[model samples]
Target: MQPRRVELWREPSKSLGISIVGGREVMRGIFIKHVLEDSPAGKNGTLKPGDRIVEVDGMDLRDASHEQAVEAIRKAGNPVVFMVQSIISTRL
Candidate 1:
């Protein structure tokens, strides 16, 4: 599970427009559920729905709870850099 980076920016009163779900209680990690095309992440086109959120800003969300992950994303300030891992592994 190689990790990748997704950077998204936002202005004042703007949201990243991402629906992140699944946390420690679920998959023991946070995953991106949906990304709105009219948002920062959607416009960037790097973030996908099935990608697991490995890290963000300076916070590691690999084993973080849903609330923790959400708070970390929000507390990341404007430009958020997410370290993510997808389901595209062929290392089997």
Candidate 2:
């Protein structure tokens, strides 16, 4: 398999990708689960494991699976908005 830009490092680690299909941002729920270290996502400070990414760039992530979501985030050619659920509850 071609080593994708973003890879998951869980058991049986493998490549992962997100998709921005039909202008809607999608996310992968599982598999290829861990985010690789030192990648763009790690540096971004928003993307983290267990964060339920509800949208990307203001696009809905419904119906998009893990592979699809990975592709979208991977191929995003511009600034993306990754809406994540906070681990620490916040009023901000």
Candidate 3:
């Protein structure tokens, strides 16, 4: 099943302090692998490792390729809004 998307706001900054991985072969979309400490994303403390980035700056990434996703982020300015879907655990 697909995860629910959430809209997030971040102020303009030099770094988001988050690392994401994506590729054609990747089963999930853009995967948030790490959130650096003392960074914008890190300070926010809402983003997590398993969250999938589905949009950047209001641009939908549902069909975006690995390169496209990267380009979108690169072309955008600081305080970018990210639409993400978090992976939920149902294990008991």
Please list the C-alpha lDDT of all candidates, in the order they appear: 0.84, 0.44, 0.72
Q: In each prediction, how many residue pairs overlap at the backbone (N, C-alpha, C within less than 3 A)?
A: 0, 10, 0
For model 3, residues 1-92, the per-residue Cα lDDT tens digits are 36544333445645667777874564547878898877777777777888888888878887777788888877776566777878776667
lDDT of 2 by residue, 9-70 (tens): 22223322331223223423322235555554555444555455555445555556655566
Q: Candidate 1, clashing residue pairs?
A: none
Alpha-carbon deviation at 71 in model 2, angstroms = 4.4
Q: How does each model score on TM-score?
A: 0.86, 0.45, 0.74
Would you list the clashing residue pairs of candidate 3? none
Stretches of candidate 2 off by over 4 Å are 1-32, 86-92
Measured over all alpha carbons after superposition, the RMSD of each candidate to the real structure, in angstroms, is: 3.3, 11.0, 3.3
Residue 25 C-alpha lDDT in model 1: 42
28 in model 2: Cα distance from truth in Å?
Answer: 9.0
**Top-TM-score candidate index:** 1
Q: Total clashes, candidate 1?
A: 0
The C-alpha stretches of model 1 lying farther than 4 A from their native spots are 88-92
List, residue by residue over 1-92, the lDDT tens digit for candidate 1.
Answer: 57888889985676788998888743677888899998888889989988999889978777788999989988887679899988753455
Best by lDDT: 1
Q: What C-alpha lDDT, on a 0 to 100 scale, does residue 92 get in candidate 1?
A: 50
